[PDB]
Design a protein around this ligand. Structure first.
Ligand SMILES: Cc1cn([C@H]2C[C@H](O)[C@@H](CO)O2)c(=O)[nH]c1=O
Ligand SMILES: Cc1cn([C@H]2C[C@H](O)[C@@H](CO)O2)c(=O)[nH]c1=O
Lengths: 290, 291
């Protein structure tokens, strides 16, 4: 399924990455991509790309392919692209539209998107990696909702469960310093109110109403909460690709709302999804091991 | 009025996305004089605007980031003005709004004006035009921000500070800008492509005829530009006791096309136009002390 309007453009400008289809030979430059790793932080995804380059035995600079005034960054290491997506579904959708167009022009088929994020845990210890087995909205429905030309639309979320299972198996054969849990993930459209936090600038609910909401989620198999999953796992399916979420937790929301861990520990925890996924990528031809 | 009663339960409040806490500073002394908060989606752009304001104010030393080095957002202060970025989209803007309005509360600030200095798609105006929003609406043309809280739909009305908008239009007639300034309505959308009626995304479920009927309808309802944050900014500030305006430049006329074809340099130049107008407004309305 290709957007029939694209070929009618003489040049396609990737506004948020600061380049166009005339900037590179897309087939030659990107044609070998089979994985796209993304997260909300430019610095974090940059450091992950560097880590993958070192695992690949690459001794050459990991250069940002995006323009200097672009909203997003983009790196390539062997068969993996790395991009940030900011925070929230709308921002993620911008990256998704532009990256999936890039893959199309490059002739890349059936690529795996991997979101390496952070999240609020539900009933798990901070620092736990959650492999999402479903991505749902705040009503626990496996759909991303959109309003297109002012009309409501919904798109089903589909996680690549085969890959989730491979990652769980891998974690069982590695010596990790954290637990790896497979469970459901809520995507919310704010950090505070929609996530049931009492510590925002506005709160219209009681602690009892909050607990009921979070306990219900937990009983329905939810183990973490973040802000992008329903976009990533609905969009990729519809453009012919696969997606997974691999997110660490930074707080147990059944215990509190504030992120009280140190900045150093948060950064450490945030690198854990990459620890697991990096080994997976090394074993599954994401990088060439030199 | 109206403060979140739960905040008094905290001995320390951690502003996660700014990388500091209520114990990092004496908030009343540090931020108590703030009367303006200027925001946009780009950290680089808002930093550069803060630098320009510091220069207008006669300040020599560089403008330093107040946010932690590993924070999601940046934060600057020049005299009575705070400057922050907000990323792209309502959810990202709401994170900024919650943390900044909490900051203002702890600092004892009242009736602050938030000014979003953004970029946008124009509807029937030339690229490079500054649009002063006189209302912010969703993609259904309703002046409400929609939320889903504990899984239940909530709607919050949007309110623009029209008196200030009128003051800015009047100011623009007294300045020598490279552009025109238009007052009109602004749609906030939850994506850049499909929700904005663009034909050039990775997915498109509609025709050009359908795109134009949508945008024509919007234009007929007084809409002159389209962006991704306005309904959050203008509903949240009202509820927390503050005021808000949007001052956005256009980078394309969406009635003619979707692609941003102007050069990257010219886009950056256009994006400085809201600050050109707003900076002079701040100079004239005690945002800075002129030394
Ligand atoms: C710790 C945490 C992270 N996140 C994720 C998703 C966002 O992209 C970003 C917001 O802090 O990090 C949450 O949504 N909720 C949380 O409680
Ligand atoms: C030019 C343009 C900018 N924007 C704004 C709002 C977002 O914060 C960011 C997205 O590019 O810039 C639009 O939403 N639509 C547009 O057509």
């Amino acid at each position: 399924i290709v957007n029939s309007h694209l070929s009618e453009l003489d040049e396609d400008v990737f506004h948020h990455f600061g380049f166009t289809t005339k900037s590179f030979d897309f087939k030659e430059k990107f044609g070998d991509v089979k994985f796209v790793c993304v997260c909300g932080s430019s610095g974090r995804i940059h450091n992950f790309a560097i880590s993958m380059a070192k695992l690949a035995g690459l001794a050459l600079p990991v250069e940002n392919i995006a323009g200097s005034h672009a909203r997003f960054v983009l790196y390539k290491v062997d068969h993996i692209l790395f991009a940030d997506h900011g925070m929230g579904i709308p921002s993620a959708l911008i990256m998704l539209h532009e990256v999936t167009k890039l893959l199309h022009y490059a002739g890349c088929k059936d690529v795996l998107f991997i979101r390496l994020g952070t999240s609020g845990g539900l009933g798990v210890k901070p620092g736990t990696i959650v492999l999402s087995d479903r991505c749902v909205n705040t009503k626990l429905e496996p759909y991303n909702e959109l309003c297109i030309l002012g009309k409501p639309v919904r798109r089903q979320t589909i996680v690549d469960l085969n890959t989730v299972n491979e990652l769980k198996k891998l974690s069982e054969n590695l010596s990790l310093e954290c637990s790896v849990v497979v469970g459901g993930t809520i995507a919310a459209n704010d950090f505070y109110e929609e996530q049931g936090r009492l510590d925002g600038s506005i709160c219209t609910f009681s602690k009892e109403e909050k607990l009921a909401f979070l306990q219900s989620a937990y009983e329905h198999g939810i183990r973490n909460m973040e802000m992008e999953g329903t976009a990533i796992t609905s969009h990729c399916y519809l453009t012919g690709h696969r997606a997974i979420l691999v997110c660490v937790t930074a707080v147990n929301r059944l215990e509190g709302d504030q992120i009280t861990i140190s900045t150093d520990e948060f950064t450490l925890f945030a690198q854990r999804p990459g620890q697991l996924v990096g080994e997976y990528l090394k074993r599954n031809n994401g990088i060439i091991v030199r």
